[PDB]
Symmetry: C2
């Protein structure tokens, strides 16, 4: 059916020196170059190193954007055996955890995300060097199997544009109704020196630690790793359901460069057509675009082509110059290939959250072959407020939302572009769920075991501190932990009317205090038998309803922590609180690897 607005309601990712998107924002805001030496536990670069570029079976760099804990996984969480974990491509392992985390971020469980089970999974991937082989389909299908998703489930390979292609497919599936919700994202890990040898034989890499996006002395990209997922849902339903919305996807396009002067040479005419078509589908005039996340790989051939393509697309709508900021996350984290698009989308969503534009690195001296004064763009150099632009169209002048475009181009010529707009809510703050000591909140936390649960409490305390959460967040925090976290075997529950009270009790738990007022601990594993026989009947589900109404929280929580299933939604007879981002499950960091 027709293009319609899609909300991004959930987000997770792991990028070089950024184990979550909060850390990623800090790297971006601070202008950090997140490139490091090839870790010895991947391979010894000295064994393959030669300064001669293009030499065979060698490499001429010692650098990359590497994520931490690439080989770690929590297979027991998923009832996967250690042997099966060893045989799984880490791309599959890490995407599974990040996708699970993105759903928790959204504030849903796998069950409640979509009651019909029509959840689509779309993942971009392009390198398959793990010793058990390229098995791309399983990166998508493992997620769909474990979480009982029955929408489309697909791995797509358009080389470096793959995760932005994946988003395009996810959107087309939502438009046609084959998905009601979708997980979209991508992954790229560097698991074998042949990865670098291939790129070095084609002289695609920089020798340095700088991906010089639109900068002087451009000499190829720094290779990088990344894994990311977003949760997509039609905007109208996300608003109706009280979801938290990072941004609105207005439209997307995919195309290819066709015949250029040689295979893998990019085509500025085709890039221009792509962007123009994405803007048309989004019903967005180019003069209202105020940030552009470029592909921006820092090659001498590609960067000028990219600016030429964008300028030509924008000039269909406007001749105005240097009104739109331009940047590329690759300047920070390198080029993470099939995950580059999802990393760029993540950067846009973080800029939108903070209404700030971050530096694009290594372009203090601009590419001397690009005259930006003849273009719509200024390559962003410093942290700055992202302003809503005032634009005269149709001889009407108005302030527009923050709108960004993002491009991702694959080496073989497959291109994608997505238009993302800030979500501006309607100002409805009845706040009839005000959390006070007279109307306290119920905080529930659970994990597969006590070690993980302990880590959950630590991360929650830290998150509260880091983001300066207070009493006004208690309602949404408790709701999200109630309905947006799977209730696992090891449980605690806390009643609190203020944040300080919650912090006090949780800190007391972390400090080992055996008895804490209004804090209940227990395990499901113990009372499985009596559970089975009483919850079948609504007779008891009605009894819970009365306990909640009467406010017998101590009773409900003393039962909940032993395994009594409670439909926390019944707690909210009038209205509903909103879902918010909170820390996600702290998967065990256990190493698994195979043998070639």
């Amino acid at each position: 059916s027709v293009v319609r607005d899609v909300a991004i309601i959930g987000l997770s990712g792991r990028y070089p020196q950024a184990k979550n998107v909060d850390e990623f924002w800090n790297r971006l805001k601070e202008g950090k170059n997140c490139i490091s030496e090839i870790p010895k536990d991947r391979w010894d670069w000295q064994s393959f190193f030669d300064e001669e570029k293009g030499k065979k079976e060698s490499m001429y760099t010692k650098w990359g954007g590497f994520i931490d804990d690439m080989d770690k996984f929590d297979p027991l969480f998923f009832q996967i055996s250690p042997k099966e974990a060893e045989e799984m491509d880490p791309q599959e392992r890490l995407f599974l955890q990040e996708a699970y985390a993105s759903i928790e971020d959204a504030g849903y469980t796998p069950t409640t995300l979509c009651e019909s089970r029509k959840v689509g999974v779309f993942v971009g991937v392009m390198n398959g060097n793990y010793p058990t082989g390229a098995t791309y389909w399983s990166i998508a299908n493992r997620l769909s199997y474990l979480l009982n998703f029955q929408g489309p489930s697909v791995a797509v390979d358009t080389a470096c544009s793959a995760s932005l292609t994946a988003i395009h497919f996810a959107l087309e599936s939502l438009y046609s109704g084959t998905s009601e919700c979708a997980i979209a994202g991508g992954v790229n890990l560097i698991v074998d020196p042949v990865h670098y040898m291939k790129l070095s034989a084609l002289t695609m890499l920089s020798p340095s630690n700088q991906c010089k996006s639109f900068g002087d002395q451009a000499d190829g990209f720094v290779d990088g790793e990344g894994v990311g997922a977003i949760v997509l849902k039609p905007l109208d339903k996300a608003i109706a359901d009280g979801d938290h919305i990072y941004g609105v996807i207005k439209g997307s396009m995919m195309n290819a460069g066709g015949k250029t002067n040689g295979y893998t040479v990019p085509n500025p005419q085709a890039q221009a057509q792509l962007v123009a078509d994405a803007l048309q589908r989004a019903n967005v005039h180019a003069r209202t675009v105020s940030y552009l996340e470029a592909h921006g790989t820092g090659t001498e051939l590609g960067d000028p082509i990219e600016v030429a393509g964008l300028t030509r697309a924008f000039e269909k709508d406007t001749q105005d110059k240097q009104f739109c900021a331009l940047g590329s996350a690759k300047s920070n984290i390198g080029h993470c290939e099939s995950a580059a698009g999802i990393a760029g989308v993540t950067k846009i969503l973080l800029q939108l959250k903070h209404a700030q534009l971050v530096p694009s690195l290594h372009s203090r001296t601009l590419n001397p072959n690009i005259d930006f004064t003849k273009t719509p763009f200024v390559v962003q150099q410093e942290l700055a407020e992202w302003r809503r632009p005032i634009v005269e169209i149709n001889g009407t002048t108005n302030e527009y939302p923050r709108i960004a475009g993002i491009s991702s181009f694959g080496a073989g010529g497959s291109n994608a572009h997505v238009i993302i707009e800030e979500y501006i809510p309607e100002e409805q703050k009845q706040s009839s769920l005000k959390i006070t000591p007279q109307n306290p909140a119920i905080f529930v936390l659970s994990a597969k075991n006590a070690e993980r649960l302990y880590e959950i409490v630590q991360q929650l305390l830290a998150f509260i501190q880091e983001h300066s959460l207070s009493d006004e967040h208690l309602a949404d925090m408790a709701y999200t932990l109630q309905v947006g976290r799977v209730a696992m075997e090891e449980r605690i529950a806390v009643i609190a009317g203020t944040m300080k009270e919650l912090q006090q009790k949780l800190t007391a738990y972390v400090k080992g205090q055996e008895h804490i007022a209004d804090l209940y601990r227990g395990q499901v594993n113990r009372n499985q038998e009596m559970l089975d026989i009483l919850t079948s009947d609504d007779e008891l589900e009605e009894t819970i309803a009365r306990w909640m109404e009467r406010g017998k929280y101590s009773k409900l929580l003393d039962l909940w922590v032993k395994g009594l299933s409670i439909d926390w939604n019944k707690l909210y007879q009038e209205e509903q609180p909103g879902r918010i981002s909170l820390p996600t499950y702290p998967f065990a960091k256990e190493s698994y690897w195979t043998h070639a």
Copy 2:
């Protein structure tokens, strides 16, 4: 936008013991089991063989569905160097040639297929064992680059359903208008014994040479190779353009099985939802489906599940029993994994062309665990006429077109289903292009060199003989060779008013006769200079128009064969002939392989 009817206008494929779809039909019609011994030039099966199923680093079969000439390619045709051909996965090489052939089959050149260049390329693939690595994106992107296609270009991996997934994406791209035409298909080649070792470790293969689809003694599939492509175009425009139409895609669906009892266990409830959703999208009542091309891999677990899923989907519309024929091409050629869907589609299109149902092999004794009398289906045992069914719906009784469904299921649970209906043309046979000795036809043939051109003539003579073409085909044959073949360097041209005359002159050419009446030979390579300077001006394009009108064919052909570009469409002032299938370019069969 909305689902609308899509024509299949072009077709090509290579399958075990079937180097083209004409041969494939002969294997299907004759009930041939196309399975062979693992060729020694792939590997020596004795080196790895052990009768113990599930043993590691071994295999317990000596069989597969192998195509001929898997390592052959004509890189010079595409201006690819021998070294680059060696480094290309043969999956990429063979898909490139089959896709090129499918466009020739349709009767288009890469230029005229779609003047806007918005040709999408969608290809399914799932194994990447060639020594230079899994590079799936290039299977699609090489085609888009060489033929200047600028629509979406993507490799999709949903494991064994991948080529039917690819078709679904192609359709969704045509509906949304991101493609105006599309190439869709898939490929699977078996290039390394590890391919068999993996499948044997999972005990997925039969020990035998029989894929026993819905048959007794089912014990796994026979692994197979395949490569196929179809050309897709909106039906209304295919009719308007005079294309030849194999069938009408009415609708498709993709979904996933979700959580089953173990990873890769198929879900009959999800298969049923898939098929029901495909029929709903196609606006097809299940009682009007009269052939079903099943996934049909011949496993004891999967075959009963598949029939259960189909029965449940069909029972939403009808309780009638055993009205629909059921079969699987895997019974003939084995399971060619990511190419299985395109092989099954090809079988449906051949059955439609001949209005015949072919045997499904190795089910003379049916699976004793499937009671087909409780289902819509009868597993087809013998060659039979495919009858248009008479069906009472809405208390109205009518004869319906031949309609088939096809399923393809991937091991990880990604499913697809497509509904294909016979194309029934409106009876318009003005035949104002009647080819006579008074109104003779112009036959043009060309190739990169004389050896290839000689092969073109032989194959055309043979095709005329094989398909009993005669005078009534001359108009469409000449038109297709005029506008549906790239005019290459080595050319011949023939004027003929009857088929016998054409056969006579072409046979004389093959026999070495230096001088033949009304047959012109020449090369472009020779007269490049004078060509450049005269054709620029329409002044001369107008002069051609008069020569054609005046009928100076000898003059035009004597010039054409030396390189003069002629717009053969101007030959047809009133009306237009139709495009027809004729043999496609006989690519050089040169071997290329790398070193691991």
